[PDB]
Amino acid sequence: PYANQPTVRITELTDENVKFIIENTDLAVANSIRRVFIAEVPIIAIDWVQIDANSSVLHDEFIAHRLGLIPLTSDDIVDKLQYSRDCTCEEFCPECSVEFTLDVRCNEDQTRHVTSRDLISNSPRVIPVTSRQDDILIVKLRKGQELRLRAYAKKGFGKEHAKWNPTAGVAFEYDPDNALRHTVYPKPEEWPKSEYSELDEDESQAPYDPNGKPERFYYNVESCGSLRPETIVLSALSGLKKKLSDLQTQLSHEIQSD
Amino acid sequence: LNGLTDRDLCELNECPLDPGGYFIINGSEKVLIAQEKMATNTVYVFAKKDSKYAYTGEC
Amino acid sequence: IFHINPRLPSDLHPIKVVEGVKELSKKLVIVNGDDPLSRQAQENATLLFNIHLRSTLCSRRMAEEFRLSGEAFDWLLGEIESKFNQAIAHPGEMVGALAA
Amino acid sequence: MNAPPAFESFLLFEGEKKITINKDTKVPNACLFTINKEDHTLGNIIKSQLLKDPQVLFAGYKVPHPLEHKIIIRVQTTPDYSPQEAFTNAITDLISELSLLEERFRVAIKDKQEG
Amino acid sequence: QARAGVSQVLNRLTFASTLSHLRRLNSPIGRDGKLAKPRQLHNTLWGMVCPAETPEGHA
Amino acid sequence: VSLMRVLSEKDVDPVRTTSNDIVEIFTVLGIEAVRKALERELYHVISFDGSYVNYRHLALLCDTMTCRGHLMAITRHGVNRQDTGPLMKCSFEETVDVL
Amino acid sequence: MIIPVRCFTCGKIVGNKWEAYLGLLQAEYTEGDALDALGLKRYCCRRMLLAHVDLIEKLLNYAPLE
Amino acid sequence: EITPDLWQEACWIVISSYFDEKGLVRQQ
Amino acid sequence: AGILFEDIFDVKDIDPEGKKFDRVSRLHCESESFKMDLILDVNIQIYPVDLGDKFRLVIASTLYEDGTLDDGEYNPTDDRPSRADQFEYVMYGKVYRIEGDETSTEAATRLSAYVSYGGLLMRLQGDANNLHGFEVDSRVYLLMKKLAF
Amino acid sequence: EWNIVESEKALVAESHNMKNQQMDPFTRRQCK
Amino acid sequence: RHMCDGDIVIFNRQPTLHKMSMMGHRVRILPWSTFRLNLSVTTPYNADFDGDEMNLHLPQSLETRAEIQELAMVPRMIVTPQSNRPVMGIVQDTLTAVRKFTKRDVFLERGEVMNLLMFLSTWDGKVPQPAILKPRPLWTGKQIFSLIIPGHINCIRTHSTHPDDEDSGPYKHISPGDTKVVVENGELIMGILCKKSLGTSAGSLVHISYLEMGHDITRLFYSNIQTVINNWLLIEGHTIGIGDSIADSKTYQDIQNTIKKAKQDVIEVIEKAHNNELEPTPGNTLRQTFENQVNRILNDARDKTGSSAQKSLSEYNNFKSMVVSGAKGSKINISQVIAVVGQQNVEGKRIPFGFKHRTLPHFIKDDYGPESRGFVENSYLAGLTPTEFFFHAMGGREGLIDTAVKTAETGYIQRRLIKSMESVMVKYDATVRNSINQVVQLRYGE
Amino acid sequence: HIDQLKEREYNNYSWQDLVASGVVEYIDTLEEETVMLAMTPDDLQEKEVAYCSTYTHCEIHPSMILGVCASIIPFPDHNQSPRNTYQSAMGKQAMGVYITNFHVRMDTLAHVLYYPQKPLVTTRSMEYLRFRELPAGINSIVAIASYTGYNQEDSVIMNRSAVDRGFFRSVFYRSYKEQ
Amino acid sequence: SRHGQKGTCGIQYRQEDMPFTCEGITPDIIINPHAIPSRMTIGHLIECLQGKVSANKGEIGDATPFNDAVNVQKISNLLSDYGYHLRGNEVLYNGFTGRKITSQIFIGPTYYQRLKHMVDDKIHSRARGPIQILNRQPMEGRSRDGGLRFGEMERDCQIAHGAAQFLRERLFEASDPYQ
Amino acid sequence: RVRGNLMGKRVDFSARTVITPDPNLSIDQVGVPRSIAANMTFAEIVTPF
Ligand SMILES: [Mg+2]
Ligand SMILES: [Zn+2]
Ligand SMILES: [Zn+2]
Q: Using an 8 Å Cβ cutoff, are D82 and D71 in contact?
A: no
Q: Which residues of D touch chain K, with CB atoms under 8 Å apart?
A: 1-4, 24, 26-27, 30, 47-48, 51, 57-62, 65, 67-68, 72, 74, 76
Q: Give contacts of L134 with chain M, Cβ < 8 Å.
A: none
* Gap from K155 CA to chain D (nearest CA, Å): 29
User: Nearest by CB to A10, which of D9, D47, D112?
Assistant: D112
Q: What are phi and psi of E11, to 5 degrees?
A: -75, 100
The span from the CA of I92 to the CA of I96, in Å, is: 13
Q: Which residue type is seen at C30?
A: I
Compute the distance from residue K52 Cα to the ligand 1 centre, in Å.
Answer: 6
L136/E47 CB distance under 8 A: no
- List the CATH number of the domain containing I133: 2.40.50.140
D54/I76 CB distance under 8 A: yes
The span from the CA of E23 to the CA of L129, in Å, is: 13
Q: Is K366 annotated as a binding residue?
A: no
* Gap from N33 CA to chain L (nearest CA, Å): 17
Q: Residue I133's closest CA among I5, I6, I20?
A: I5
The span from the CA of M105 to the CA of M92, in Å, is: 7
Using the Cβ of C97 and the Cβ atoms of chain M, whether some distance falls under 8 Å is answered with yes
CA-based R_g, chain A, Å: 24
Q: Count Cβ–Cβ pairs < 8 Å, chain E vs chain H.
A: 9
Q: Give contacts of E47 with chain H, Cβ < 8 Å.
A: none
Q: Which residue type is seen at K349?
A: K
K393/L149 CB distance under 8 A: no
User: Nearest by CB to M25, which of G10, G31, G33?
Assistant: G10
Compute the distance from residue M29 Cα to the ligand 3 centre, in Å.
Answer: 14
Q: Using an 8 Å Cβ cutoff, are K43 and K200 in contact?
A: yes
Q: Structural domain of residue I142, as residue ranges?
A: 5-148
Q: Which ligand has the shortest distance to the CA of A89?
A: 2
The span from the CA of N14 to the CA of N36, in Å, is: 9
Q: Which ligand has the shortest distance to the CA of L86?
A: 1
The span from the CA of C96 to the CA of F58, in Å, is: 11
Q: Using an 8 Å Cβ cutoff, are K374 and K333 in contact?
A: no
Compute the distance from residue M6 Cα to the ligand 1 centre, in Å.
Answer: 9
B34/E24 CB distance under 8 A: yes
Could you say which residues from 79 to 98 on chain D have a Cβ atom under 8 Å away from some Cβ of chain M?
A: none
K92-236 carries CATH number 3.40.50.150: no
Q: Which ligand has the shortest distance to the CA of G42?
A: 3
Using the Cβ of E22 and the Cβ atoms of chain H, whether some distance falls under 8 Å is answered with yes
Q: Which helix (H) or strand (E) covers residue D30, if one does?
A: strand D30-36
Using the Cβ of G55 and the Cβ atoms of chain A, whether some distance falls under 8 Å is answered with no
Q: Count Cβ–Cβ pairs < 8 Å, chain F vs chain N.
A: 7
Tell me the residue length of chain I.
149
Q: Using an 8 Å Cβ cutoff, are M84 and A194 in contact?
A: no
N18/K53 CB distance under 8 A: yes
Helix axes J2-16, H8-21, angle to 10 degrees: 150
The span from the CA of I123 to the CA of I120, in Å, is: 11
Q: Using an 8 Å Cβ cutoff, are L6 and H15 in contact?
A: no
* I-D interface (Cβ pairs under 8 Å ≥ 3): yes
Q: Which ligand has the shortest distance to the CA of A154?
A: 2
Q: Using an 8 Å Cβ cutoff, are M127 and N13 in contact?
A: yes
Chain centroid to CA D15: how far?
Answer: 21
Helices (H), chain L: 2-6, 15-21, 81-91, 126-129, 160-164
CA-based R_g, chain C, Å: 17
**K152 Cβ contact partners less than 8 Å away, ≥ 6 residues apart:** C1, K185, K186
- List the CATH number of the domain containing G42: 1.10.10.60
Q: Using an 8 Å Cβ cutoff, are M28 and G44 in contact?
A: no
Q: Using an 8 Å Cβ cutoff, are A29 and A236 in contact?
A: no
Are A69 and A175 part of one and the same domain? no
Q: Is A106 annotated as a binding residue?
A: no
Q: Which residues of M touch chain J, with CB atoms under 8 Å apart?
A: 68-69, 71-74
SS3 K425: strand
Q: Give contacts of L165 with chain A, Cβ < 8 Å.
A: 69, 162
Domains within chain D, CATH numbers bracketed: 1-115 (3.30.1360.10)
Q: Phi-psi bin for M58: left (phi > 0), alpha (psi -120 to 50), beta?
A: left
User: What are the strands, taking DSSP E only, across chain I?
Assistant: 7-14, 24-31, 37-43, 54-57, 90-100, 110-117, 120-127, 138-141, 146-147
Q: Give contacts of K43 with chain N, Cβ < 8 Å.
A: none
Experimental technique, in short, is cryo-EM
SS3 M8: strand
M33/K238 CB distance under 8 A: yes
Compute the distance from residue N10 Cα to the ligand 1 centre, in Å.
Answer: 24
**A96 Cβ contact partners less than 8 Å away, ≥ 6 residues apart:** A81, A82, A83, A84, A87, A89, A154
Which of E17, E22, E49 has the highest number of chain H CBs within 10 A, making it the mutation to test binding with H? E22
Compute the distance from residue K11 Cα to the ligand 1 centre, in Å.
Answer: 17
Burial of F7 (0-12, 13-18, 19+ CB in 10 A): middle
Total count of domains within chain I: 1
User: Nearest by CB to K371, which of J24, J25, J31?
Assistant: J31
- List the CATH number of the domain containing A55: 2.170.120.12
Total count of domains within chain G: 1
Nearest residue in C to F62, CA atom: C99
Tell me the residue length of chain J.
32
Q: Using an 8 Å Cβ cutoff, are K50 and M8 in contact?
A: yes
Tell me the residue length of chain M.
179
Q: Give contacts of I98 with chain C, Cβ < 8 Å.
A: 7
Distances (CA, A) of K188 to C89, I139, K152: 34, 15, 11
Are A64 and A103 part of one and the same domain? yes
Q: Structural domain of residue G11, as residue ranges?
A: 1-66
* β-strand pairing of A137-141 with A112-115: antiparallel
The span from the CA of N49 to the CA of N34, in Å, is: 27
The span from the CA of L171 to the CA of L95, in Å, is: 10
Q: What are phi and psi of A233, to 5 degrees?
A: -60, -45
Q: Using an 8 Å Cβ cutoff, are I112 and I123 in contact?
A: yes
Q: Using an 8 Å Cβ cutoff, are G56 and G1 in contact?
A: yes
DSSP string, A73-126: --TTTTTTS--GGG-SSSS--GGG-EEEEEEEE--SSSPEEEEGGG-EESSSS-
Distances (CA, A) of F38 to E54, F45, K438: 41, 11, 21
Q: Is K48 annotated as a binding residue?
A: yes
Q: Residue K200's closest CA among K321, K45, K79?
A: K79
Helix axes K205-212, K215-236, angle to 10 degrees: 150
Label residues F32-52 b or e (16+ Cβ within 10 Å = b): eebbbbbbeebeeeeeeeeee
Q: Using an 8 Å Cβ cutoff, are G1 and L115 in contact?
A: yes
Distances (CA, A) of E20 to A39, K18, K269, L70, L129: 45, 40, 46, 10, 10
Compute the distance from residue I105 Cα to the ligand 3 centre, in Å.
Answer: 81
Q: Give contacts of C96 with chain F, Cβ < 8 Å.
A: 60, 64
Q: Using an 8 Å Cβ cutoff, are L8 and H20 in contact?
A: yes
Q: Using an 8 Å Cβ cutoff, are L113 and L97 in contact?
A: yes
Compute the distance from residue N19 Cα to the ligand 1 centre, in Å.
Answer: 10
Total count of domains within chain A: 2
Are A72 and A182 part of one and the same domain? no
Compute the distance from residue G6 Cα to the ligand 3 centre, in Å.
Answer: 8
Q: Is G7 annotated as a binding residue?
A: yes
The span from the CA of K180 to the CA of K183, in Å, is: 10
Examine the fold and report which residue of A147, A162, A177 is the final residue of a domain before the chain moves on: A162
CA atoms within 13 Å, Cβ hemisphere of I98: 21
Q: Which chains touch L (3 or more CB pairs under 8 A)?
A: A, B, E, G, H, J, K, M, N
The span from the CA of C84 to the CA of G21, in Å, is: 81
The span from the CA of L149 to the CA of K230, in Å, is: 6
Residues of L taking part in catalysis: 154
SS3 N36: helix
DSSP string, L108-154: SS-EEES--PPPSEE-SSHHHHTTTTS--EEEEEEEEB-SSSTTSSS
Which residues on adjacent β-strands are paired with residue I89? I144
The span from the CA of A99 to the CA of A150, in Å, is: 7
Using the Cβ of M44 and the Cβ atoms of chain L, whether some distance falls under 8 Å is answered with yes
The span from the CA of M23 to the CA of M91, in Å, is: 10
Q: Phi-psi bin for H9: left (phi > 0), alpha (psi -120 to 50), beta?
A: alpha
* Gap from E10 CA to chain B (nearest CA, Å): 6
Q: Using an 8 Å Cβ cutoff, are L62 and L44 in contact?
A: no
**M137 Cβ contact partners less than 8 Å away, ≥ 6 residues apart:** M131, M175, M176, N5, N9, N10
Are A136 and A47 part of one and the same domain? yes
Question: Measured at the alpha carbon of residue A31, what is the angle toward residues L158 and A240, in degrees to the nearest 5?
Answer: 105
Q: Which ligand has the shortest distance to the CA of G44?
A: 3
Are A60 and A27 part of one and the same domain? no
* Gap from K181 CA to chain L (nearest CA, Å): 26
Are A147 and A179 part of one and the same domain? no
Task: Give me the torsion for CA of K25, K27, K32, K38, rounded to 10°.
Answer: -30
SS3 L32: helix
Which residues on adjacent β-strands are paired with residue K9? K25
Q: Structural domain of residue A66, as residue ranges?
A: 43-162
